[model samples]
Target: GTLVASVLPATVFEDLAYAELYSDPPGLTPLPEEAPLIARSVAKRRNEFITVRHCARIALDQLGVPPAPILKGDKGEPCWPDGMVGSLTHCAGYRGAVVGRRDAVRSVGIDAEPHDVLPNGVLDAISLPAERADMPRTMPAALHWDRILFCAKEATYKAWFPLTKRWLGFEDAHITFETDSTGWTGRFVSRILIDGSTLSGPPLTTLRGRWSVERGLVLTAIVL
Candidate 1:
């Protein structure tokens, strides 16, 4: 019921229609075509798959697109309907989806994670040393800087792949964060470090995104 929308910026709403499901509905089942995608998975994986697609269906409904099973691309990206682009994320008790007309939005990526610190050693694996050095000194101390960095990169990749169809590694982008006066919400930028000259569209060397931490979740979104 738009729970995920609460974390996004106005720029997102201007082009996208989104939806969120905090928990799986009782007796809900995946559409026929969608069931195979997770047929061999555990109960947790099955629930996440169905609930997130439920959110995607609600979003597509909001966008005036008829009901359709959301399939996965070769790279595991969600395959949207013709003339549409969007992203989906499910974490812990939260699932979210956002859809927009292809004419209005080239792409969109959104992610939500439990509001907690990244596990030990995992931060070093995903972040650059420079990012690690500057974040603590400049970003707000009360926030989980490490986890925020992770979420930002994830959102960045979601937005990146749909356009270039290229794999953007964790080290491919350098991320920086800015905190708002309220101390709970902020924005971030992902500077693409690789050569973009070969991308299908105009070379986009940078992507802008926003973040909000609330209701026990850290959410991020990027639109292009």
Candidate 2:
């Protein structure tokens, strides 16, 4: 199993940054060239391609594989060479990657978002009544944790979908998070739905995750 992690220089993960994560030795043979349109799109975002390239390099070195040009899959996922699995994520000022053997990891995802204000409309869509009720009553300001929870849901979906090949709604997954000086862990309370069919297997237990902040970015990872 290949375990890889990377930290980008703060400022690379900004709004509109088009970051991508991939592994080299890039198991998927016959990798396609980077499309001109994709390059142009990424170029428009300051430091977008730089951060993606940095993360990809780190993943390659960690995997002990020669770096291959990154490519995108038909469904828009980062395409890796045969036998290698990886996940990529970035938020304002941070980017990261993790890769491993296909059989070693069932699923993986990473995400980062600034601790800035989340749009009210976005918050309304992701937040549940219970979550609002759980907010600190004495605090006058809006809760920031809600945004983190929303981000966690997104990261979880990205991680789970690749393995299950299913589309999950925001409410389909419930997240409970706990953090300490060392790291954070997120427990997922939900099920997976595939192509209009509800998957009934292992009761879809909680997933383990880690989180931290570096150079003004909130980074998180979920592994199943």
Candidate 3:
């Protein structure tokens, strides 16, 4: 299945377009601007980098923006066209890009992770002590809630970075999840623990998003 379909919900709240790739296509090449960013990386890194940029171009083209180089800022954030805001995600066997008008959407964040438990001792690095409680009791044992929480935090940081141009630590945002009766699709809210007003559409205090698990991956998206 496509990554975008699994991650983002079908909604009309904003004018948005998305594209995803299950595998890197033949003869895929990075645009001139994108190449320099990953020139020193290995073949595997280059493949995902180029493929995801291709996904971004397709999504932007769908949104009425002509294909152009999407560069990265000093903070490693994708610098979209003047009127556009978007997010990109790549993981084993998947790559995705989603774009929306700046007027309609202030920022967007999307992420994908393997549907497996976090590496040994990695969960503590990304989760707060309070964040660790209730995950097991609230969700079934089959779900990798730790990995989902990691995915959610990454999505939140992605959505937050463009506006604030700063880092949002995992400990900086306490995340909680609510799964549907099916236990496959759910939503998450990230309560920003740091001080100050740093976001545009929503309060800097909290960011919300959705997640779904299928095809051996956990996908997440946040639009603001």
Best by lDDT: 1
Runs in model 1 deviating more than 4 A are 1-3, 11-14, 197-199
Index of the highest-TM-score prediction: 1
lDDT of 1 by residue, 142-208 (tens): 8898888899899999988888878899899998878878887888889999975535669869989
Model 1 lowest lDDT segment of ten:
6-15
lDDT of 2 by residue, 93-191 (tens): 455566655555555677777766678688768755665565323223433666666666777777766665566677665555544434322233333
Model 3 pairs whose backbones collide:
none
Superior by lDDT: candidate 1 or candidate 2: 1
CA lDDT, every prediction? 0.85, 0.52, 0.84
2 or 3, greater by lDDT? 3
TM per prediction? 0.94, 0.69, 0.94
Pick by TM-score: 2 or 3, better one? 3
Model 3, span 1-224: residue lDDT tens: 36566556577434788888888888989887778888899988888888998999988887778988888885889889889999998989889898888887878999998899899998999999887996656677889999999999999999988888777887898888888888888888888888636655445777889898888888999987
TM-score (C-alpha) between model 2 and the true structure: 0.69
Candidate 3 ranges with C-alpha deviation above 4 Å: 199-203
lDDT of 3 at 147: 91
